[PDB]
Amino acid sequence: GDCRCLCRRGDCRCICTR
Protein backbone atom coordinates (compact mmCIF):
# COMPACT_ATOMS: atom_id res chain seq x y z
CA GLY A 1 0.00 0.00 0.00
CA ASP A 2 3.10 2.14 0.04
CA CYS A 3 3.44 3.58 -3.39
CA ARG A 4 6.80 4.54 -4.76
CA CYS A 5 7.59 5.65 -8.25
CA LEU A 6 10.54 4.15 -9.95
CA CYS A 7 11.79 3.96 -13.47
CA ARG A 8 12.63 0.63 -14.94
CA ARG A 9 14.78 0.78 -18.11
CA GLY A 10 12.98 3.88 -19.26
CA ASP A 11 9.52 2.92 -18.16
CA CYS A 12 8.53 5.04 -15.28
CA ARG A 13 5.99 3.28 -13.29
CA CYS A 14 4.67 3.56 -9.82
CA ILE A 15 4.90 0.40 -7.85
CA CYS A 16 2.98 -0.07 -4.69
CA THR A 17 4.27 -2.29 -1.99
CA ARG A 18 1.98 -3.08 0.97
DSSP string covering 1-18: -EEEEEEETTEEEEEEE-
CB 6 within 8 A of CB 12: yes
Distance, in Å, from the CA atom of 17 to the CA atom of 10, rounded to the nearest integer, reads 20
Residues in the chain: 18
Round to whole Å and give the CA distance between 1 and 12: 18
- What experimental approach yielded this model? NMR
